[PDB]
Assembly symmetry: C3
Homo-oligomer: 360 residues x 3
Amino acid sequence: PTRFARGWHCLGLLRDFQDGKPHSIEAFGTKLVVFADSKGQLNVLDAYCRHMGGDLSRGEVKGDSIACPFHDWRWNGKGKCTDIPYARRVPPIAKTRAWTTLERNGQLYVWNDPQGNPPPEDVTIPEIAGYGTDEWTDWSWKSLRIKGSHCREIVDNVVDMAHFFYIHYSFPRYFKNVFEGHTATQYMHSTGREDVISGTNYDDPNAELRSEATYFGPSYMIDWLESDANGQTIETILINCHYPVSNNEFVLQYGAIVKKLPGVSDEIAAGMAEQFAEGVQLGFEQDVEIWKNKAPIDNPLLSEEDGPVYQLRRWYQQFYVDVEDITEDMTKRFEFEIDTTRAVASWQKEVAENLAKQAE
Amino acid sequence: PTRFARGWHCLGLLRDFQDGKPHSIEAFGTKLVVFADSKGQLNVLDAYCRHMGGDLSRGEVKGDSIACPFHDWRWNGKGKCTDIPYARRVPPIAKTRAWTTLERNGQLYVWNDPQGNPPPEDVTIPEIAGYGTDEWTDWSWKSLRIKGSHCREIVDNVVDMAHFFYIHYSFPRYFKNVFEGHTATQYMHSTGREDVISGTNYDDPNAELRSEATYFGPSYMIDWLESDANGQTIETILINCHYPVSNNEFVLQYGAIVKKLPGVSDEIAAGMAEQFAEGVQLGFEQDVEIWKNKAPIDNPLLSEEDGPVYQLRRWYQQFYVDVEDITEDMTKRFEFEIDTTRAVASWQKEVAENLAKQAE
Amino acid sequence: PTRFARGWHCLGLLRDFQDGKPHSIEAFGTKLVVFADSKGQLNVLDAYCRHMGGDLSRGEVKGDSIACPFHDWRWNGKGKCTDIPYARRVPPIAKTRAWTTLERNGQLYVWNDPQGNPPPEDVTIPEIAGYGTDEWTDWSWKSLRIKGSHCREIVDNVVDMAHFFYIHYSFPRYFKNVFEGHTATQYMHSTGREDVISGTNYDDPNAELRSEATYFGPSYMIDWLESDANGQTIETILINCHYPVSNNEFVLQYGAIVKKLPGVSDEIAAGMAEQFAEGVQLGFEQDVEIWKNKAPIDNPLLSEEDGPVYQLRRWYQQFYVDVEDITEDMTKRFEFEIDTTRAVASWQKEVAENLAKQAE
Ligand code: FES
Ligand code: FES
Ligand code: FES
Ligand SMILES: [Fe+2]
Ligand SMILES: [Fe+2]
Ligand SMILES: [Fe+2]
């Protein structure tokens, strides 16, 4: 009916699944069950039992298999029926759909592919250096649902230079995109507007914000943020990721970790990190207010100061065709820098005009 | 997909739009923004910005243009992009859909037409003599949504003689329809039932109610009501109008103004007018109870005492075909009078039977 | 669009319809009105009036006809317009859809058939011996709606031997199905599990439960239950029935009557019957928890201990084809006994293992 993106998708944080009860996720137009085996590893299958349609997510784990609450059949992490407890044997074709998993960076990922193939080794989610380490906090994480929109409308932001001023209240002084293979990257530097105070990580006019944000596949973005304040620089890592529930609904997730400042107690270091982590969340929530309130546009009208929207969408298209049909122009290295001079000039004028009105 | 009526449609009262923030209206299967320019005149455009789909209704007005809250592009009342503030020029094709407006009788109207043409001069909404005048009150106005029905099911009432007895508790003693060009008219006179007391303008058995109600196009009806009580006659004007939200939902609006009785103080004159205005609203709300609870019928079964339903629907059909395809039988003057003698005889009998039971 | 089962369907208890106002039932993809005539007999018609679509369920009864609340036309139990009170005659084709009724066992049934034929005499609902009698209680009855599922998913339970252990906490020691003509029967005997206490009629490990449950057509099941406790045996009768609201929603109803134990006062006999009646309801509510939480399966994966699912569905299919197309294999007597030995052996082991853990 409706085609979902081939790639890694994060279903949430490991710590929310290791408990070791089963969990339901509505995703990819169906329902999924997540459960830990006896060795604590996570498994993902279609939630609905292939016997008579019982809900495996409402079952319990027994050994290394999930047990259906209707007639107690047992399904393992590869989708195989390991036992029908009241029958001599298992019909030889007792198999359901199993999703390949990846546990990394304190998160759970599943591989989706309509063609039914496994993830190739060169398509993965990178290890975030610093995670699982006293130096860095643990994820502050949040989640919501957006309806009436596509996943792609989030991805469109990769190339959106102008919204940094209007939505994040900052001047994007450097802005560059690089699309290559199965990744899409935004590099940008900003300083905060003097005519606005809102407690985000974009706020400070005295600090330069340096951002490198990359989609590792269609659904998962890691944004490395450095805020140079005084001599010292605050390092954070923001995750922006999504997965489709249906053709018309998706889950959007975002989380932050902050690097602890050294030569200070834990009480104070962990308290200030949390303080900055909230600022990052608030920045992200500025995008959310737009994303919850906007129509899709297949044929956007573009200005000379727009980022490379059509090339971004071309790159993204690779994840919605069969791998044999992916073309060179989708995956070949493409880069584009916007000279932000004109925009910043317009913006600095406007901000000066505001500041003049603020006093007199 | 689904075709909406060509014609003037009232979106509400001017005073609710002159404030001068933007307003959203869900109508004609899309979302609209209404906003005042610097000279206070109202403008209507599609709400969704043609750049990347931001919601203009959630923006602000700047001069004579609405400003998108996503990247601040500026759109004027003719749908032209007047400025991209951070870019040198406006792409030469920067245009969105603009709706032609009419401000009159303290209300805002928009012209809808699938063929995309402007309103011809001979198709308009007449000036209501008496509006904007100390002699007459201002609109008491109300609004609601009806789902699971068509606009046409409201229009069907033009020819419904019998419902005056069952729904408005009155005897329709005179009843006539005239359809002509783009108007459809109901003339009727009534007196109230003695066996029922409910505080509507149809209630009084001693007063004769005279009504002339005309659809000026497919969506907007003005009903001139005169209630002859004693020597003196109370004059009111009721509006019944609608506009479609989707193929399956519409907004129904109704409002009243009353002429102030002279030779009395303002406190008392304005207080009694309001008193009568409520009676009119209550009468209208009797129709609403039916309209919220009734199925559409494409092939109604008709009695010898029904009004000219098929001719009414034929007239109405003109608004759902292209102007080149409108036929003579749709627009040619048609009139039909129901002789209400038989019905009134049946009704007066039944009412007498009730009154006999009331006492003994 | 979507085809509903030909057969008797119970709309509820007679006592809820004899009052003698009209009642609406949403069923078979439309709305229905139920009303008592002057002799107290019940009538069922489409709710929407064939004049202009008024809601007959919101009308009142006048003599032997329901009166539309919009223009007061009168419709009798055979769907004929008996009067247009304000008109000389009734158009000669004034007919709406009438549903054939059956009042029996304190319940109201309607005959549905897409082919528009009347119920044949040999297809009926049997008189429940004991109903309407001091010896037996009156129906304790309950009702709910299930969405996202088909009627058939309830019917699938006829052949579900295994769920008695997992869902009703009992050992099915005897289990047999017989399908024949337009009936489908489940015979089973059980004893309760010692490792579980929940206050249902399946609970007692010391009592043998004997059940004979038969679908008399596609929608209505009567289950004769005998619980042999001590010397004395408790007799109950459970009804499980349904009717479709739409293709995607249905109403599920269940009720119980209990036979009063003799040689005891009424206060105590009626109090204990009610006590047992609740136990029966709780048992049924165990199925409801599964039925509210399960996906349809067109191609169920079956074990060697499954009941004859495909033959059951073949039998059921007769009610969704035209009577001329019903085949011998649908209606020919078919019987199947499951030898429950292996399952009970597995189950008794598992239960012993639990009991061992319970103590130590
Ligand atoms: S439905 Fe899952 S075991 Fe029967
Ligand atoms: S979406 Fe309207 S200005 Fe960019
Ligand atoms: S709609 Fe039923 S009588 Fe007119
Ligand atoms: Fe952003
Ligand atoms: Fe009316
Ligand atoms: Fe059951």
